[model samples]
Target: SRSYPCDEKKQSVIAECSNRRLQEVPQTVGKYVTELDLSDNFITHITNESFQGLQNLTKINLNHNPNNGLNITDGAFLNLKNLRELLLEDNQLPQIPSGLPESLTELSLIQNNIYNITKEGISRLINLKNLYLAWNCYFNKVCEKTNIEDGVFETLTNLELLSLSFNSLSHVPPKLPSSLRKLFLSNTQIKYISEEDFKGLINLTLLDLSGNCPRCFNAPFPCVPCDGGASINIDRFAFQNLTQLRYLNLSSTSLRKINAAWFKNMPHLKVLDLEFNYLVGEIASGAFLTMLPRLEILDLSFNYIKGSYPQHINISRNFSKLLSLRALHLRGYVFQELREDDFQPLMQLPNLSTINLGINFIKQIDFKLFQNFSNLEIIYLSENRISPLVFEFDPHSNFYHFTRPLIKPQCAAYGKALDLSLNSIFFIGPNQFENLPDIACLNLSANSNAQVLSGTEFSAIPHVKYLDLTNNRLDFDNASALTELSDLEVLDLSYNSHYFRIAGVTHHLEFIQNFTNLKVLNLSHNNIYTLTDKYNLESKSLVELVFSGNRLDILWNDDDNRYISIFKGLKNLTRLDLSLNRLKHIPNEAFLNLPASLTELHINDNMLKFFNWTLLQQFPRLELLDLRGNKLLFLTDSLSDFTSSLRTLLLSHNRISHLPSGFLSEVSSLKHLDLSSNLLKTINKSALETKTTTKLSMLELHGNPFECTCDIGDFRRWMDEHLNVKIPRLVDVICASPGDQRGKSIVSLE
Candidate 1:
């Protein structure tokens, strides 16, 4: 009996042989196995006798195989009568395999070279429900366009989902199965769609036709314009029969106009995406969209509308028919101003919750425009030119002091989210956000001119829980700036300087001591060099802290006689990032006051030549230690008894030459160890032999030069005996010494 290189459970019907480098199907697989994974192997051929006995398989995954070419003889899979799902992605199949199981329900031929699809190739699979043929002609240009003969999919009466994206199809395949509920034809060469293309696909609920006729205007990636530089033309009644369609995507299809008759019969349509188009004059009128009365979500972002800056997009009387609308996206319109009635037509939409108006270069906004959106939960105004003066009293009105609240208090209570990042705001005066009392999340990141924050700026929005102030020009200030922000949970103050100007220098951190509910705090890339022991963080709720990319080497001043603990009272801190600090060493006193609840410590990319490994005993719950990109020369064997919960230790990109024999055998709970890109010459057998019943599962030893001499014989035997221990990069572990074994894999050596 041949031993199968696979994992099989006792008396179970499943077997896995993935990534086993098998050249053919394993005959030793039990006949009762119903699921088999033969993916990521070197199996190049599948003959009739390859799987003659294992006929009970219901699912088979043969993806990522055959480094050379895949050859499937006729009737190779004829015996798998019970198979329901077959995956053959990322192969070199010129055509569909013959004699596939008739009971199959799903077949994936993605990333293959199948250029032509004929009716006979899959005519027997009448029960197939999902077929994926995308990326077949994407790599091989020899197949200029995939040829799908007429009635190719006509026999698949039970098919529901068919995906043919990323192929070279010039037009929609003829006579698709009427049972299809979702069809994806994105990123193809189809430039025109007529009503007959989808004559009988009435059951389709979702259709994607994006990137078929793309406009080449400032595209991030290389793209070709449509033939004759014209937009994709769709007949007026192209979608009249698709009355049950609920979602349609026409994005990136260079259409210049919208025909109201195109959606005249789609009564059930809820989502319509017309982004990345060239609809100019129609966007200002918004007349063509009246046919979609039940549409709930609409995206018209990144469309090319003519006229100079400050163009008026009047939607006052257009969207009155869409009472079911819930979300609207109109980003990148370049409209400098928002008139009072621009959104008047949408006031009756009781379910409207989200509105995204970002990237519009809008300089002014009338606060009254959003006062009546009772159900609005989010408003995105990022990438605009609005300043803090918008919230100030009207300069021309003498009754400004007696004016009612700009935003309705009841509506603001329901709208909890606001994003104003990437704007041109310079300063925030007191009570600027007083009208938004119930706002919970506020994003003010990437505001280039942001400088100062009046201490009482956020006193009104006391319910804010999340705040982002990254990439601004704000200098360190007192704790009064966050006086009423007691409920803040996450605060990001990273990159708070302009260019190389180190402006975020604060000697004390008493500003965050009063935040009793804060959980995460990020102060990275702020040029903070030192922290004195002036005050201790009284909050015990902070769990994660990030202080990387700072000049923190001064924290360990040799001239100072007393060692101060920067993180004094943070008893619940679980993760800390102190990487990229240019530190030569971490003194024992540095770990004296670290929270015992710490589970992860990242100090990678430093200049440490030696580290006291026993210091990890301070954190009993430490599970992950990242020390990569350091100059460490050795690790002490005394760490065996410390850090019982340490499961992952990353020491890659170091200069360690040897490991003590007690390193692995004593760490009982160590499950993963990474030592790649190191200077180790060889790993002895004694170093891997566990004495305390270790739980080590994964060890990475690649990028290390190993001497394949007589001394390595015992290590080779240990590797063979311990098959449970996984070496993820075993192929890169090559022999670097002895002329006979040079450049050969260590596992292949005798």
Candidate 2:
């Protein structure tokens, strides 16, 4: 009588027993088990009686076994003397798994095929404090090289987080452990770091040498540069004893030089991620940025830094000696024009607040140079080529002449957020956001010649509350500039019409009744086929309405009867996304008058074969019903009139073979039921008996086609009496039937 598909909780001292196809280990794991997962599982071999009685295991998760077949054996964790976290990640363990039990303080052995760690299998873990040998040499390429033996982590002196990323290690593994405080060595093949490679890592506070050395321009993946194309050379005294280094990730390091003696002493350096390097002309001689005096977040984004047309980026006078610089990214620096003293040395950084300058090919922007960053609050300028005539003042050209006083420059009153997405802006000049009165988020997405055709272009930033304008070509027909945005709340006009542009909000939707305090309205893919509904479009503080793709097959209006419902006044609509929308049929008076405070309805992809289930009695607080992809073969046997507040029913892929019987007691508050890739072969175990009024908990029948003979034997004894009903892909619930239980797994036969 051995039954232990674990789930023991405190009383049993926590024993989850992951994925339970467990081929071993459960020798009655309950001596007050203290957390033992047996991850994923098919358990290979861990015999020392496999943790005899799990000496109150202190976290042992044999991560994903069956890789190279986990063979443990040597005392198999010597009676787990209160082990403290040992997760054997992935698992092909070719080494370092002998008798390990110095009461491990978090030891992962990531991806495992362990090449060579030495010091006689981890010098006794010295109470390891987080050590995950990443991908152990080329994972799956099965160990081409990892070798770490200098002092084998020098007895881990309480190792403080060491991840040896990817691993094909070329160097830097010498006598480590100055109580390392985060050292990852990303994508390691460590071309060269020298200065004894972080000499003694004086309590390093995060060091990630990103991707070893990558910079293969325009890298959309498969980038290879380090070894002979050279570049990862660091040693200018390497990191001058990492003075308690504070977050330094040399991102994609094809670093084209930056040696102010390689940052002499790293004075508690604060966040410096030289993003995708190629640092041209030594970044206009900022001399590796003097000496990060407690630098605060500086990410030289995608550095190849070429220039010409008006490129006078005089390194902000060496960033005025980083007086605690605060967030400066410089995204993809191409630098095409930005004169006003290019940042006049960042105005002695009064704790500068976020400035990205996204994909900089910037086409002029001197809005008084952000009116002197009074603690600038976020400004990205996405994919720049900006237009709206850089906030026009064009006095017939010649940069505004005749005594020059036309007013312009008044932006930073602590500007709150402005992205200007993918620019090329076409129109927006009503004093261009008049002094940006405390702006509260304005993105302007994919600006392909953005257009709003008057609405006072955001009436002096009213107190804007998130306005995206997604994929713009916007032509805004009316809502009179969003009824002066009464503190607008999220409006993402998705994919604004292209191909013969007719942009968004074409034929009057009554501008959502002037959106008084709108709350998320997305208008997906803007070729919206219909919605002229003359007026009556209320909002009541709308709450999420995405109208997926477009071409509304029908929302009901048989030429007028006062068109009953276009989401009836959305009295607090809870979430509705009419997916893809090629709907084959809807008419039940199109669900009469929806919005009963609807609670999530996606109407997945669509070609709807049949779904009138009494229109679920007009959404009695509908709780999530997606109707996936769709050609749904059948349903309406009875949703018990209104699906008792249905709770999640996706109906995957769909060609639905059957369900009717009582369809899970008519959605008795169904709790997650996917019916994946349908066409079921057999069911009817009284259609999943609701005795005890079950609150069904998760069932996703993977690509169904089950019929494990014996005429389905009580649907395999009702899945062995429900075992608490959570069949997530129950091993793809196999068996197409007869021939000796075909591919088996109907909970593995009787």
List, residue by residue over 193-255, the lDDT tens digit for candidate 2: 888867787888889887677776556544567766567887778888887888888877778
Q: Give the per-residue lDDT of model 1 (tens digit) for 297-376.
A: 88888774544575555563777777788888887667878766788777778888778887888887765566567566
Clashes of each: 0, 1
Quote the lDDT for 745 in model 2.
59
Error of 2 at 601 (Å): 5.5
lDDT: worst 10-residue window of model 2: 399-408
Predicted structure 2: lDDT = 0.73
lDDT of each: 0.76, 0.73
Worst 10 residues of 1 by lDDT: 391-400
